[PDB]
Amino acid sequence: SNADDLQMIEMHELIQEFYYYALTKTVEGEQALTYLQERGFTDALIKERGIGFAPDSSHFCHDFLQKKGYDIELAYEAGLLSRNEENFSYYDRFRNRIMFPLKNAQGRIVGYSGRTYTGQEPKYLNSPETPIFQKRKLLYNLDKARKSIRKLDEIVLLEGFMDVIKSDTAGLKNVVATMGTQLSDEHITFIRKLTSNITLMFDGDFAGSEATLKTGQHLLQQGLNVFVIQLPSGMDPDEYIGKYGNDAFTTFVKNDKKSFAHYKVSILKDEIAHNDLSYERYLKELSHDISLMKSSILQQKAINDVAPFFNVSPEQLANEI
């Protein structure tokens, strides 16, 4: 019910204050605090993002919510507690992790992502699916980014919410990320209401390239104008910012912004040039990809950019489309 949803949100927003105190003030939170500061998190940024620490006692969140008169079973359904099968008892889901509040589109905290700081697995532990937290709908930083997304008429999608935080601080405001999932149809519906321009800047590795192709193709099929920023090998935005600085980052992100079709064929370049079977199939694919582009201006430019990869003229490629 809406009433239960509100209770669950309250739990999240109240425990946030305690997590923040635990991180910034308490003895147990000192190592986690140092880890964050070594990653460039200022005291102001930590406060701004509401970042906290979950102690390792396994009943920190439990005792707090109990004291505040919240229904324990509801706290479990809210994804803040876990439950033992045998003893039927409840305990903290998040233990010895740095706590990143996850806000919904309306700016309310509806979940957490807990990162290890001691090399534990899993690296990130998120809230489970709950009535208020749904990964297929939530986009990290959306409530904060919405204003700049509309004004710049563009959204930039990153892989990690950590990259989003750093990019935001660096000056790139129109950035969001999924919570470790593939962009969903619901996400695209939400995004379409804000802008028709979407830029993908995933990690500069093989997995990142693959995710870019899959996500880009989906977006293109749904009628969005898709662009790609290719990061240097082995780097994500956070690592780029840390190595080159904020000014270098904001310059980089507005430099080589390529239409999806152009990025795609550049990836397939060698296979096309060596494998004749792949040559034919990818010529048909890219023809189809270009035909999907709503922007006639960018469609024409894509034809000019893609054609040389197949050793054909722009006119020959245009005919195939």
30-63 as b/e, with b when 16 or more CB fall inside 10 Å?
A: eebbebbeeeebeeebbeebbbbbbbeebebbbe
Give least dist CB 161 to ligand CTP, A. 5
Q: Which residue stretch of 120-128, 210-218, 264-272, 294-302 sits at the interface with ligand CTP (rule: CB under 6 A)?
A: 120-128
Biggest alpha carbon–alpha carbon distance for the chain: 73
Residues 155-214 that bind Mn ion (CB under 5 A): 160, 203, 207
Residues 100-119 that bind ligand CTP (CB under 6 A): 115
Residues 217-246 that bind ligand CTP (CB under 6 A): 236, 238
DSSP-derived pairing of the beta strands 81-83 and 97-103: unpaired
Residue 122 touches which member of ligand CTP, Mn ion, none, C-beta under 5-8 Å by kind: ligand CTP
Residue 273 touches which member of ligand CTP, Mn ion, none, C-beta under 5-8 Å by kind: none
Q: Does 162 bind ligand CTP (CB under 6 A)?
A: yes
For the chain, the residue count is 321
Question: Is 4 one of the annotated binding-site residues?
Answer: no
Cα angle: 126, vertex 127, 132; to 5 degrees = 135
Residue 207 touches which member of ligand CTP, Mn ion, none, C-beta under 5-8 Å by kind: Mn ion
Residue 154 touches which member of Mn ion, ligand CTP, none, C-beta under 5-8 Å by kind: none
Helices (H), the chain: 2-24, 30-38, 43-48, 60-67, 72-77, 142-152, 161-170, 185-192, 206-221, 237-244, 246-252, 260-267, 269-274, 276-292, 296-306, 314-320
For ligand CTP, the closer of residues 243 and 284 by Cβ is 243
Q: Which amino acid is at 316?
A: Q
Q: Hunting for tokens 């460039």 — which residue is that?
A: 40
For residue 59, how many C-alpha atoms fall within 13 Å in the half-sphere facing its CB? 5
Question: 199, 257 in Cβ contact below 8 A?
Answer: yes
Residue 124 touches which member of Mn ion, ligand CTP, none, C-beta under 5-8 Å by kind: ligand CTP
Q: Does 289 bind Mn ion (CB under 5 A)?
A: no
Question: 224, 187 in Cβ contact below 8 A?
Answer: no
Q: Which residue stretch of 155-163, 266-274, 276-284, 308-316 sits at the interface with ligand CTP (rule: CB under 6 A)?
A: 155-163
Residue 161 touches which member of ligand CTP, Mn ion, none, C-beta under 5-8 Å by kind: ligand CTP
Residue 179 touches which member of ligand CTP, Mn ion, none, C-beta under 5-8 Å by kind: ligand CTP
Q: Does 123 bind Mn ion (CB under 5 A)?
A: no
Give least dist CB 160 to ligand CTP, A. 3
Q: Which residue stretch of 62-70, 156-164, 255-263, 284-292 sits at the interface with ligand CTP (rule: CB under 6 A)?
A: 156-164
For Mn ion, the closer of residues 22 and 241 by Cβ is 241
Question: Is 71 one of the annotated binding-site residues?
Answer: no
Q: Does 305 bind Mn ion (CB under 5 A)?
A: no
Other beta carbons within 10 Å of 277: 8
Question: Is 203 one of the annotated binding-site residues?
Answer: yes
Name the token pair of 18.
């305690």
Q: Does 238 bind Mn ion (CB under 5 A)?
A: yes
**Burial classification of residue 300, based on how many CB atoms lie within 10 Å of its CB (0-12 exposed, 13-18 middle, 19 or more buried):** middle
Residues that constitute the known binding site for Mg(2+): 159, 203, 205
Q: Which residues bind Mn ion (CB under 5 A)?
A: 160, 203, 207, 236, 238
